[PDB]
Design a protein around this ligand. Structure first.
Ligand SMILES: Cc1ccc(-c2c(C)c(-c3ccc4c(c3)CCCO4)c([C@H](OC(C)(C)C)C(=O)O)c(C)c2NS(C)(=O)=O)cc1C
Ligand SMILES: Cc1ccc(-c2c(C)c(-c3ccc4c(c3)CCCO4)c([C@H](OC(C)(C)C)C(=O)O)c(C)c2NS(C)(=O)=O)cc1C
Lengths: 141, 141
């Protein structure tokens, strides 16, 4: 897609831990966190966080059941987030970056944040970081 | 200040918990989290997070001892963050917003994220959210 407010949320697995990955669909910009468990509470909280930082209008996911819980629904309700029904793989890419930098850090969560840094700063010609900023700016002005 | 890469980090206290507050100095844009303890590990991790999301060049604080630990120093080293020596109160403002919305949520951390949302979206004429995006965009282009 190309629309400024569309985000993609999924959980992926590494080392028996779970990684919540949000992708800004138009930019390829990523926000990712290690969460203790794959619950609605964790997703609901992350949504709240994400919505305060970026203008989040619609959220897509590859696992619809992610968004069925009352907590998640409460977050989408309060932040004014609709579910994306317009989109009918960066978890592969992010895992590559985590694997390259894993030895550098003790905790997986630390390695994840390093991978988010690298991904968002690498120029492919802008970076994902510059792309998101320009996309939201030109949409605002 | 007015420089695009300057951030201000401090911890504040509510309900016997600690709130790490990052302010983007030029925009008034805020990133805040409840952390379990006021340690260097928490600060170091938050820095890593922040640096992956925004272009963080320099960090100021009102408590210099915040930045003395090896963990914090390791994060600033890896992300390429210098300490701000150019700047010689939104913790009052953020606390007002938390107090207004406190009843709405069970957990303080939830209330905090709601307060970050409100602060960043409220237009004062742009919002802090639009201000940061425009500041980083016009600096990039
Ligand atoms: C003397 C000394 C003191 C601290 C560390 C030490 C460091 C530097 C990092 C770290 C920080 C920042 C940082 C990196 C590592 C890797 C590059 C990016 O920034 C971490 C790091 O956890 C954090 C949650 C990010 C703090 C990790 O998960 O590795 C951890 C856990 C350490 N170990 S610790 C706090 O003692 O348990 C090491 C030595 C030799
Ligand atoms: C049936 C039912 C199910 C869930 C809740 C319930 C809700 C809605 C919220 C919440 C979520 C999202 C949200 C808000 C509240 C307030 C507005 C912003 O979004 C939270 C909320 O914690 C989170 C960490 C954000 C999940 C809080 O700290 O309050 C918590 C802790 C709940 N309670 S719970 C998960 O059972 O322990 C309530 C009812 C009646």
């Amino acid at each position: 897609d190309c629309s400024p407010g569309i985000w993609q949320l999924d959980c992926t697995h590494l080392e028996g831990k779970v990684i919540l990955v949000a992708v800004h669909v138009a930019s390829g910009y990523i926000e990712a966190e290690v969460i203790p468990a794959e619950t609605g509470q964790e997703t609901a909280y992350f949504l709240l966080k994400l919505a305060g930082r970026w203008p989040v209008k619609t959220v897509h996911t590859d696992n619809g059941s992610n968004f069925t819980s009352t907590t998640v629904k409460a977050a989408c309700w309060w932040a004014g987030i609709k579910q994306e029904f317009g989109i009918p793989s960066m978890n592969k890419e992010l895992k590559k970056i985590i694997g390259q930098v894993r030895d550098q850090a003790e905790h997986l969560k630390t390695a994840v944040q390093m991978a988010v840094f690298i991904h968002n700063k690498k120029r492919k010609g802008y970076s994902a970081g510059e792309r998101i900023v320009d996309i939201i700016a030109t949409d605002i002005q």
